[PDB]
Structure formats: C-alpha cells, structure tokens
Amino acid sequence: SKIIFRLLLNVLMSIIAIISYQWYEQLGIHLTVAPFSLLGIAIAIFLGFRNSASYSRFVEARNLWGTVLIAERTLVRQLRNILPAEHDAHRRIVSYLVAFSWSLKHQLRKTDPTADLRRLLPEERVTEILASSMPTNRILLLAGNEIGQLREAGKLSDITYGLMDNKLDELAHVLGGCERLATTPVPFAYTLILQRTVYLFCTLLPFALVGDLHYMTPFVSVFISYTFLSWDSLAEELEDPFGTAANDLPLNAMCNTIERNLLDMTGQ
Amino acid sequence: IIFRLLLNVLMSIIAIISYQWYEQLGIHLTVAPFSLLGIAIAIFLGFRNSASYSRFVEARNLWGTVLIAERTLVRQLRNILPAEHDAHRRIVSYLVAFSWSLKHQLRKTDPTADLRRLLPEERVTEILASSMPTNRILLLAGNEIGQLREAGKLSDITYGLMDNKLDELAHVLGGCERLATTPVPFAYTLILQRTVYLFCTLLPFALVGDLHYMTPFVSVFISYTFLSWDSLAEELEDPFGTAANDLPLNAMCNTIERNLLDMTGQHPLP
Amino acid sequence: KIIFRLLLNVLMSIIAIISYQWYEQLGIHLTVAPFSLLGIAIAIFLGFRNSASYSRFVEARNLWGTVLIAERTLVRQLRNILPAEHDAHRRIVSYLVAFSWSLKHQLRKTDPTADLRRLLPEERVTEILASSMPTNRILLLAGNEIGQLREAGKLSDITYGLMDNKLDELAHVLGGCERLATTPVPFAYTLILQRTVYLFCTLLPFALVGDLHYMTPFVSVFISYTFLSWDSLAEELEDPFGTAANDLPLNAMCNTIERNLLDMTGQHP
Amino acid sequence: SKIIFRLLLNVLMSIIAIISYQWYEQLGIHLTVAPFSLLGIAIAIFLGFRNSASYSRFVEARNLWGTVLIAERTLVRQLRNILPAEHDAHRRIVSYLVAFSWSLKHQLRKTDPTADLRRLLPEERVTEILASSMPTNRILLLAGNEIGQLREAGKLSDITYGLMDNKLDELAHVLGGCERLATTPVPFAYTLILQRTVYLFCTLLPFALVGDLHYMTPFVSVFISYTFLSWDSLAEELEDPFGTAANDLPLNAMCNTIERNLLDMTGQ
Amino acid sequence: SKIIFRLLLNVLMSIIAIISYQWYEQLGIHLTVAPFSLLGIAIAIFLGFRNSASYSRFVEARNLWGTVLIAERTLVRQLRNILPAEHDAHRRIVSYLVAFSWSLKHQLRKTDPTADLRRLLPEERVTEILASSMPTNRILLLAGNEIGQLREAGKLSDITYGLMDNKLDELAHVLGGCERLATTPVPFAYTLILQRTVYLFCTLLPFALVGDLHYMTPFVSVFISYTFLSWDSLAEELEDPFGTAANDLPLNAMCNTIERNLLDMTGQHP
Ligand SMILES: [Zn+2]
Ligand SMILES: [Zn+2]
Ligand SMILES: [Zn+2]
Ligand SMILES: [Zn+2]
Ligand SMILES: [Zn+2]
Ligand SMILES: [Zn+2]
Ligand SMILES: [Zn+2]
Ligand SMILES: [Zn+2]
Ligand SMILES: [Zn+2]
Ligand SMILES: [Zn+2]
Ligand SMILES: [Zn+2]
Ligand SMILES: [Zn+2]
Ligand SMILES: [Zn+2]
Ligand SMILES: [Zn+2]
Ligand SMILES: [Zn+2]
C-alpha cells in the first residue's frame, strides 16, 4: 500500500503547521474547520457515488465470468442428455469450450494464448483461430460448426440444435460484455477530479485543524486523511478486474475451475 | 458488540478524569473535526450497506428461483406425462437433493445424510465422488429427462420446455457460487470496520470538553448507531456465510420438499 | 399514532425547559453540535432504508401487475388458438380467477375457502385446500386443462408451449410475492432505526434548550415530525401486502383481474 | 411556475423577521442556525431520494412507450418477411397496431379515443372496442384474432405464429405497465410530508438566520428557499409522466412517430 | 471545459471580499459560514443524484451499442453454422448489418449517412433507404427480407429462421433504446436549476468565508468552486452520450470495430 507515503507526508504537513502556526497572524492567514467540513462532505458524497460505479463494474465483470461457467456446464449437460452416445462430439465441443475460456482470459490479459490452444486443439484449428483478428470469437464459430454438423447429420433436430445454439449466444454476450468493460473504463474525468480534490484536501487539512487541535493535529489529521484515502483507494483496486494483481479477478483459477468442471461431466 | 459499548463507556470515564491534564501538555479535541469525520464515515457506511443489501437481495432471489423452477418442472411433468409416476418420483428426488446439496455447499456442511435419505446409494457415491456434487445432481436430473425423450415419451419441444427449467437451476447454482466466493472488496472492509471502531473510541475525548459528565451517555448513543449500522452491513454482505441465519435457507429447502411431495400425491396420508 | 410521539415530544421539551434551571447545579451540559452529527447520520441511514422499502413496494406492485398481464394473454391465446373450446375457456378462467384470490388470501394470511367455493366445484376446492400451497395447486389444475387439450390433439406441442409459458410467468409471480411475504427488510434495520430515531427525538430538546430556551418545543417537534414521518412511511412500504393506508389495494386489484377475464370470455357480472 | 409566489412570500417573511427581531428578547424567543442546519440537511437528503424515485418512474414510462415502437416495428417486419404477399392482412394488423398506440394514449390521458379509432378502423370494429370496459386490451385481442386466422388458414405455422404471438405479449406488458403507473402513483405521503416540511422550513428559516445575517437575511433566505423549492417542484413534474404539462411525455408526437413508422414499412 | 473562466472569476470575487470586509459594518452586511454550509451541502446532495442519473444514461448507451456487436456477431455465426455454403447471402446480410451500425451513428449524430451507405450497398438500395424517414429501420427490414427469402426457398426452416429472426429483434431493441435516449434528454429543468444555483453559490461563497479565512479566502473558495463546477459539467457531458465531447461515446471507433469484426478476413469462415 503506497497510501503510507501520503500519510507520512501528512504527518510532515502537520509538523509544519504546528511550528509555522506562529507566523499565521503576522501574514493574516487563517484557516478554520467549517469551510473544510463543507468541502470534505461534498468530496465524501462524490467519492460515494464514484465508488458505487467502480463497484458495479467490478461486479459485472464477476457476473460475466460466472456466466461462462454456467453456459458451458449446461451445453455439456445438453450434449450428454440429448446425445449420450456421441462422445467423440462431446470431446471436440468440450475442447472448444475450454479453449474459449482460456482465450478470453489471454485476450483480457493481452497474453499469448498459443500454448493453451495447442494443448487443447489440433494445430489446424489453432492456426485457423490465430489467423483471426478476433480469435475468441472465431472459437465460438468453430463450436457452432460442431453443433451444425450434428444438425446436418440428423443427430440434432432444429429444436435440439436451437437449444444448444442459445448457449453459444450466452457466451457471445459474455465476450462482448468483457470486451466492453475492457475498453470502457469508469470515465477518466471522475478519477482526476477526485484525485486532485482528495490529495489537495488532505494536505491542506492540518493547516485548517492546527488552530483547533494544536499538538493533537498530526493524530487527528492522519485519521481523517486515512479515512478518505482508504475509500478513494478502494475504487482503484476495483477498477482493474481483469488484471494480474491480488485484488483482481483470479482468472487463471477461474479458467482451471471451468476446465475441471467440464472434464468432470465427461468422465475425463 | 455490547463489549465495544462498555469499552466506550470506560473511554468516556478515562476522558473525564484525564481531561484535567490536557492543557499542561497542549492537546485539544474539538467537536467540529469529529463532526466532519463522523459524517464522512456515515456516508461511506450508507453506500457500503447499500452494496451489502444488494447482495442479500440477490441471494434471496436466486433461492426463490429454485423454488419456482422446481415447482414448474414438476408441474410440467404431471401436465405432459401424467402417468409416468416412476419418473415423477425419481426427478423429484433429484430436485429435492439439489436444494439440500446447494444449502450444504454454501454452508460448507456435510450433505451426506440428506443425500442418503433421498437417493439410492449408487448415486450418492457418484455424487459424493464429484468435486461439484450440486452440478452432478443437475446432470442426473437431466438424464432422467433425456431418457424420457429417447423412449419417445417426450418430443423435442416438450423436452425443451423442461430443459429450460434445468437452465433456470444452473444459473442459480453459479449465482450462489459467485456470491459465496465473494466478498467483492478484498477485505478492505476490515479497514472500514476498524475505522468505525477507532472513531467511536476517540469520540468521548472530543466530546468531553462540551459534554463533561454527560459524555458517556451521548458517546455511547452515537457509538451504538455507527456500530449497529456497521454490523448490519457485515451480516448482509455474507448471506451464505460462517456466522449467518440459516432459518430461511433451511425453511426454503423444507418448503421446496413439502411442495414437491404435495404435487406428487405423496401427501397427505392415504 | 405518530401524533402521540409528537405530543410526547412536546412534553419532553417542557421538561427540558423547566429543568434547564438545575442544569448547572447537576453538572449537565448539552450542546447542539454532537446531536447534529448524530442527527445527520440517522438521516443518511433513514434515507437509504426508505429507498429500500420503496423498491420493495414497487416490486410487489409489479408482480401483481404481471398477474393481470399473463392471465390476459393466456386467455387471449386460448381464444386465438382454440376459438371453439369455450368449455375449456370457462374452466381455465375460473382457475385463473381462483389463483388471484388465493394469492391474495395467502399474502393476507386469510381463509380462501369462500372465494374458492364461489368459483369452483367442491371436489376441486377440497383438493386445493389440502395442499400446503393452494395457489400452486391451482396452477397445476390449470395446467391439466391445457395438458388434456394437448393429449386430445387440439393443441400441438408448440401451441401447448406458448400457453405453458404463461403458467411459468404466474409461478414466477407466486414465488416473488412469497419471497416478499417471508422476507422483510432485516429486522435489525427497523430495530436500529425505530429505537434510534425515537431516543434521538426525545433527547433532542435537552440539547436544544441551551440555545433555544422557550422556543425549544416548536423546533424540537418540527425536527421530530420530519424524522418520524420519514421513518413511519418506510415501515408501511415495507409491508406491501398489509392493511395499512399506503398498502396495495389487493381486493380491488383482484376485482379488476376478475372483471377483465370475464370481459374477454363474453360473460357479464 | 407558481414558485415565484412562494419566493416573494419568503422575502415577505424575512422583512417581518428583520423588523420583529427587536421584540425577540422581550418575548423569550431565541433561534440559532445550528438546529436548522440539521433540519435542512435532513430535508435535502429526503428530497434527494424522493427526486430519485420520481425520475425513475418517468424513465420507466418512457421505456414502456419505447417498447411500443419497437414491438410494433418488428411485428410488421415479421409479417412482411414471413408473409410478403398477404397485404390485406398487413393493413388490418397495422391499423390495429396504430389504434393500440392511440387508444393507450387516450386511456392514460383520460380522453376520448373515438375519432382516432374511427380514422383507423371500420365503425363495426370501433363500436365493439368502445363497448368494452378495457378498449386497449380488446384491440390486442383483435390483433390476435388476425394472427390466429392466418394460422388457421395455414398461412402461418405454429412456429411462425409463435414468433408474432411473442410481440403481442410485449405489447400486453406495456399496457399493464402503463396502467400500473397510472393507477399506482408515487405514494401521496411523499408529497404530503415533503411539501409541508419544505414550506414550513423555508418560512421559519429567516427567523433563525436574522440573528446572524440581519439585513442580509432576505437574500440568503430566498436563495436557500429557491434551491429547495426548485428541487421539490422538479419531482412533481416528473411524477406525472402521462400528463399535459410541458415537461411530460410528448405522447401525441410519439403516437404520430409510431403511425408514420408503420405506414412507412407498408408502402403507405 | 470553460470552468477555467469561472474559476478565475471566482478568484476575482474573493479579492473583492477581502478588501471590502472592513466595510461590512458600515453597510450593514453580515455573512456567516453556517448558512452557506447548509446551502452547499444541499447542492452537493442534488449534484450527487444528478451526476448519478447522468452516468446511468451513459452506461445504458454503452450497453445498447455493445449489443449491436454481440447480436450482429451471432447472426453471422448462425448464418455460417446453418447455411455454410450460402456466401452470397452472407455478404448481402453482412453489408446490411454494417450499414445498420453506421446509419445508427449518423442518426444519433444528426449527420448525413449517404457516403457510408454508398460505400457498403448498391445505389438502388441506398435510394430506398434514404427515401425512408427512418433509414435505420428500413435497413433492418431489408436484412429481414434476405432471411425471409432463404426461408421461402426452403433453405431455412421455420425454426432456424426464428433463431435468426430473434437477433434482428435484438437490434430493433437497440435502435429503440438509442432513439429514446436521443429524443428524450434528461428534463431541461435539471440543467437550469443546477447551473444557476451552483454558479451563484460559488460567487457568493467568498463573501461568507472572508470573516473566517481572511487572506486565505481566494485559495479555499476556488478549491470549493472547482469541486462543485467540475462535478456539474461532467454530469452535463455524460447526459449526452452520443455527443462529440471527450467523455462521450467513441461512436466512430465502435462502428469501425463492428465493421472489422464482420468483415474479419474478406468474410472467410471455416
Ligand atoms: Zn443460460
Ligand atoms: Zn461423453
Ligand atoms: Zn490490476
Ligand atoms: Zn406422479
Ligand atoms: Zn404434501
Ligand atoms: Zn408475459
Ligand atoms: Zn370461448
Ligand atoms: Zn421459470
Ligand atoms: Zn421485442
Ligand atoms: Zn404488405
Ligand atoms: Zn383483398
Ligand atoms: Zn366519445
Ligand atoms: Zn443476444
Ligand atoms: Zn460465408
Ligand atoms: Zn480579514
């Protein structure tokens, strides 16, 4: 937590306020608590709404990934319930569904999905997927072809084909949703306004408290600053849900969970 | 929580007797800065509790869907296949097993007794062998529906109508699992929890100059309001958690089971 | 009975006025600043709570709105798809009407026996009353009517499905209402707020008297009224199926539903 | 806006407060700002949440009408894509769909729909619709009859019938949604509490401000009153989305847009 | 952001307050901080709710546009999966889908869609689209005709037609959603009340602060002014998500992405 640096900086500003409080009158500068209460409350209100937006975004990201697991579970269930004897098809479709999850992760992380794809799919399909400017989307197309062939071969009717196609649609909404969350952030002018106001507020605060608090200034000023900064920093942690950091989504573990689930449901 | 109130009373008594030595050291605590701090904390508690409440509401909605989806699936089975009571009973057993297994999964308790009560031991072994027992129960229910389809008893259309309900259930399973792995905040909530505590303990020292002897009464009142609101959010954030009220989840599982034995002629007594 | 607490608050103000003399001689001082902090905090919490209570009221109203919608369309489908099956129209409508009234009784915790006998043959009434969820049984019975039309070949699996969907929709309503009936907002929210607001309002004049003196009861009652009004409104909204003023006129709503369904089946009241 | 009357009344209350401030001590009345800050902030908080609720219902009303345009567009699109040669059926259904919109408009406005109906439908149908206690619902039923007849004639299969039947369902949800918004208001106790509280607050305020502000009382008091009154009055205007008031939904314009759209998609 | 003018103007009001504070008594003017704390906090609350509503519009607008990409992707996927050999139909339908996006953008931006339409479609079709008072809707209708013809030719069954028909409706919901956001703005009385109120508050503020702050008045007044003014103007920008401002939707980039996706590899699919 690099929050400690500005807390330390805040302690230093408090010490300056205490020793420089002498020259306050000799300059004509006074700072009371009342105007900073107004400012502080206004900032708290705006921080509240902002964090709310950051929170909703983090939650949606969690929701989208939850849907991958749900839709892939049911698609495999449908394949077993409707075509219990078609395990060759079971394995092929499962490999694509598993590939989709990993490919989505790599896409959001901007990493190379090549190794994971080669572990799951024949090289012909991997080349075919990587040739696309939108590889994760290309993967859905391939899963659709597998289902499409079962339809053409008469193993799936249009009805049962439709039941499985619906699940691919659910995955498509996940892909677009994540892509939307990745390119659209909470707008950058929310963060600038708040960062500029919060930092300036905390550093000016001890100068406004010193008249009332004297020697207790650094303790109370640090308490108030810590409160605003903790709340402000919470938004920063929630804003990067697809990242690698510790408070980011465990996408690797999630992908492993998805793969473990699908191989549990096909006897592998 | 009552303990932190008593601790707050002691801090007030300390504040009263130690207020004497304040000047000869130069330490001052006025109400205005703690008014600022208090209102900000209240605002954050408001928004935090709002998020917690949202999580609680979703958890109940998800569980309501279990009750709804299972009711209609059984209704469809009777309306579409009124004579297939062997199939009725087996599927009902899986749906009931699903609810209890879901409850046990979210509560991290042993589902063995409920499973052995409802299903033949062969399936219980199969379900317990899986790392995802609740999902396996859905898979087994799906097989029952799938077999009726191959026997020609269900068409693809009527199969699809029932298949949708298994989908209404899978979404619930994933939804609860997401709510279970949660919280969202990375235990930054702990900070927030502590912030309220430090505020309540520092409060009497800031009030004593104005309130004097009346300090412990007003200080404990304010503390009670903040601590209560904080603990309420804590309870709402974790609807499936370690220290939670299980009367609803248990009543719901009982309600679901009572309904399905109600819609399959197993109730009342002949 | 909020008027009682307003009158009681006036009395507490008078106590504050007459006892302000002995304030110094006891060692008690009460300033406004700490009570502004406490008061604003409570207002914030009342604000969020009241918002939640309203949402719950709106949802309950929505669910009942869906009953009217789904039942209208089910009857519409029956006439459009099976225009000659008027016996089936009548039986299904009677079940749909029974469903609404039964839902009302379930939410009001009252006896549906009289309404059921007015609408259905006694054999069906007994079957429905025997169930732990009579509304669910009514949906099941309505489902049998559609199911029997399907077995007779009058409905295909597709057209059966279109109607089965409306029964899905009613079930989703039943569960929603049930969820709202069994869930209150958590009690710890009403307990915190009701005790806290009351205690705050009665302690307030003791804190105001030093500034306001004789003007204490007027300002104290105004502030108390604002907080109490907002608090009591939330509790009424929290119980949308209850008897209190701003609750759902469920009886009128069921009458509306029944008149609608008899309008679309050529019957007159 | 009759708020200007209450602002002037507030200026009147301030001048009274100024001239009567003399007799304050001689009566035993003291009024400080602090208790009114508490009350004022509380009122603002409740006004904030209330206005939020009013805005949301206005938004729902607009959404419901948006759905009318969407569902009717696609129903007409479907009729054409599925039955391009059945123009007799096209016109009849379009007239019903247009009548539905106008009938809904008149219903929410509590006005007479007769001319709009007679302009769109043969008198034979109009009397039947007007004879019902629920004319808009009867129009959906009649639109349903047209689709049902196309099915019985074998022009629509059960599947394609179902595709259009779904659109009638969307319209049914709109009708119910609108009716609910019309009969259920934001509860009258939100208006009752807030108007009494806001008005009494604004009139009592100068008496509490005069001790501190004196001659500057009317300016600061009217500003505060204007802020609260404007925000309160905004909520009332939003609470009645189907009304005649300028900031209400342009339902007449919306119905014209719908009619123009459907006749645009039928070569009319 | 023209706030920089009003901030400098606020510095001007502060210097006036400082030099005239002596003459307060000689005029009969008294101004304390307390009433302006009340007024300021009320304004902050209302700004909070307003900005929240504005963001809500921004989020929905972004969602509607996201759906365009999703629905159009799956429609093409379905065409490839169900009719893998009908590439002539693929190309015609894709162009309509691409035309739909650009036409929607121009409609919301009130610009001329002629150039984009001629780039994607034959002139005969362009005139038909331009002849309609609602070109975006006409494009969906034409895309619908393509699907409808494949059905009449026996290439699509009623079932598979329906699967694709559903996606066109999804696009219709986007079109209606955007039009609602475009034709209905937030009520004009939100901008009127708040802009006047915030500005008047910020300029009057230093006159009330000078008694406490003296020489520090311009610094604190501009700080408070920046906070209120920034939040207000951002709200203004987000309320018009289809506008040209910098915190608005990059509609041009979005349409390019949609076109690139559907025309990913000269329309080549496996
Ligand atoms: Zn799903
Ligand atoms: Zn297999
Ligand atoms: Zn990160
Ligand atoms: Zn049975
Ligand atoms: Zn029973
Ligand atoms: Zn419906
Ligand atoms: Zn009939
Ligand atoms: Zn359902
Ligand atoms: Zn639609
Ligand atoms: Zn035509
Ligand atoms: Zn003709
Ligand atoms: Zn008339
Ligand atoms: Zn979609
Ligand atoms: Zn192609
Ligand atoms: Zn000065």
CSV table of N, CA and C in Angstrom, one decimal, chain E residues 187-225:
chain,number,residue,atom,x,y,z
E,187,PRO,N,-34.7,16.0,-18.2
E,187,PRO,CA,-35.5,17.2,-18.3
E,187,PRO,C,-34.6,18.5,-18.3
E,188,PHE,N,-35.0,19.5,-19.0
E,188,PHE,CA,-34.2,20.7,-19.2
E,188,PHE,C,-34.1,21.5,-17.9
E,189,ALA,N,-35.0,21.2,-17.0
E,189,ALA,CA,-35.0,21.9,-15.7
E,189,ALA,C,-34.0,21.5,-14.7
E,190,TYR,N,-33.3,20.4,-15.0
E,190,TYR,CA,-32.2,19.9,-14.3
E,190,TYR,C,-31.0,20.8,-14.5
E,191,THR,N,-30.7,21.1,-15.8
E,191,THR,CA,-29.6,21.9,-16.1
E,191,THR,C,-29.8,23.4,-15.7
E,192,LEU,N,-31.1,23.9,-15.8
E,192,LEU,CA,-31.4,25.2,-15.5
E,192,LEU,C,-31.3,25.5,-14.0
E,193,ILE,N,-32.0,24.6,-13.2
E,193,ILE,CA,-31.8,24.8,-11.7
E,193,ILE,C,-30.4,24.7,-11.3
E,194,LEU,N,-29.7,23.6,-11.6
E,194,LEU,CA,-28.3,23.4,-11.1
E,194,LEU,C,-27.2,24.3,-11.6
E,195,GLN,N,-27.2,24.7,-12.8
E,195,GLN,CA,-26.2,25.6,-13.3
E,195,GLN,C,-26.3,27.0,-12.6
E,196,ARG,N,-27.5,27.6,-12.6
E,196,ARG,CA,-27.7,28.9,-11.9
E,196,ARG,C,-27.3,28.8,-10.4
E,197,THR,N,-27.8,27.7,-9.8
E,197,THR,CA,-27.6,27.5,-8.4
E,197,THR,C,-26.2,27.3,-7.9
E,198,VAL,N,-25.5,26.5,-8.7
E,198,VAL,CA,-24.1,26.2,-8.3
E,198,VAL,C,-23.2,27.5,-8.6
E,199,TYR,N,-23.4,28.2,-9.7
E,199,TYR,CA,-22.6,29.3,-10.0
E,199,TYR,C,-22.9,30.5,-9.0
E,200,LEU,N,-24.1,30.7,-8.7
E,200,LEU,CA,-24.5,31.8,-7.7
E,200,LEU,C,-23.9,31.5,-6.4
E,201,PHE,N,-23.9,30.2,-6.0
E,201,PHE,CA,-23.3,29.7,-4.7
E,201,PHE,C,-21.8,30.0,-4.6
E,202,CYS,N,-21.1,29.6,-5.7
E,202,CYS,CA,-19.7,29.8,-5.7
E,202,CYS,C,-19.2,31.2,-5.7
E,203,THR,N,-20.0,32.1,-6.3
E,203,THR,CA,-19.6,33.5,-6.4
E,203,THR,C,-19.9,34.3,-5.1
E,204,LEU,N,-21.0,33.8,-4.4
E,204,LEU,CA,-21.4,34.4,-3.1
E,204,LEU,C,-20.5,33.9,-2.0
E,205,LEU,N,-20.0,32.7,-2.2
E,205,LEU,CA,-19.2,32.0,-1.1
E,205,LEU,C,-18.0,32.8,-0.5
E,206,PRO,N,-17.2,33.4,-1.3
E,206,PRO,CA,-16.1,34.1,-0.6
E,206,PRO,C,-16.5,35.2,0.3
E,207,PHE,N,-17.7,35.9,0.0
E,207,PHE,CA,-18.2,36.9,0.9
E,207,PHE,C,-18.6,36.4,2.3
E,208,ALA,N,-18.9,35.1,2.3
E,208,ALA,CA,-19.3,34.4,3.6
E,208,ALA,C,-18.1,33.8,4.3
E,209,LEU,N,-17.0,33.5,3.5
E,209,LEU,CA,-15.8,32.9,4.1
E,209,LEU,C,-14.8,33.9,4.7
E,210,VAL,N,-14.8,35.1,4.1
E,210,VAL,CA,-13.7,36.0,4.5
E,210,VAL,C,-13.6,36.3,6.0
E,211,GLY,N,-14.7,36.3,6.7
E,211,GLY,CA,-14.7,36.6,8.1
E,211,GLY,C,-13.8,35.6,8.9
E,212,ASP,N,-13.8,34.3,8.4
E,212,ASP,CA,-13.0,33.3,9.0
E,212,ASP,C,-11.7,33.1,8.4
E,213,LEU,N,-11.6,33.2,7.0
E,213,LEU,CA,-10.4,32.9,6.3
E,213,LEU,C,-9.5,34.1,6.0
E,214,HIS,N,-10.0,35.3,5.9
E,214,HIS,CA,-9.3,36.5,5.6
E,214,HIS,C,-8.5,36.4,4.3
E,215,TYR,N,-7.2,36.4,4.4
E,215,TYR,CA,-6.3,36.3,3.3
E,215,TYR,C,-6.3,35.0,2.5
E,216,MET,N,-6.7,33.9,3.3
E,216,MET,CA,-6.7,32.6,2.7
E,216,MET,C,-8.0,32.3,1.9
E,217,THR,N,-8.9,33.4,1.8
E,217,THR,CA,-10.2,33.3,1.1
E,217,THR,C,-10.1,32.8,-0.4
E,218,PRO,N,-9.2,33.4,-1.2
E,218,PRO,CA,-9.2,33.0,-2.6
E,218,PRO,C,-8.9,31.5,-2.8
E,219,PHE,N,-7.9,31.0,-2.0
E,219,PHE,CA,-7.5,29.7,-2.2
E,219,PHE,C,-8.6,28.7,-1.8
E,220,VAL,N,-9.2,28.8,-0.7
E,220,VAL,CA,-10.3,27.9,-0.3
E,220,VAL,C,-11.5,28.1,-1.1
E,221,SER,N,-11.9,29.3,-1.5
E,221,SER,CA,-13.1,29.5,-2.4
E,221,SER,C,-12.9,28.9,-3.7
E,222,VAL,N,-11.8,29.0,-4.4
E,222,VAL,CA,-11.5,28.4,-5.7
E,222,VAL,C,-11.5,26.8,-5.6
E,223,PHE,N,-11.0,26.3,-4.5
E,223,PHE,CA,-10.9,24.9,-4.2
E,223,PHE,C,-12.4,24.4,-4.2
E,224,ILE,N,-13.2,25.0,-3.4
E,224,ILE,CA,-14.6,24.6,-3.3
E,224,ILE,C,-15.3,24.8,-4.6
E,225,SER,N,-15.1,25.9,-5.3
E,225,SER,CA,-15.7,26.1,-6.6
E,225,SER,C,-15.3,25.1,-7.6
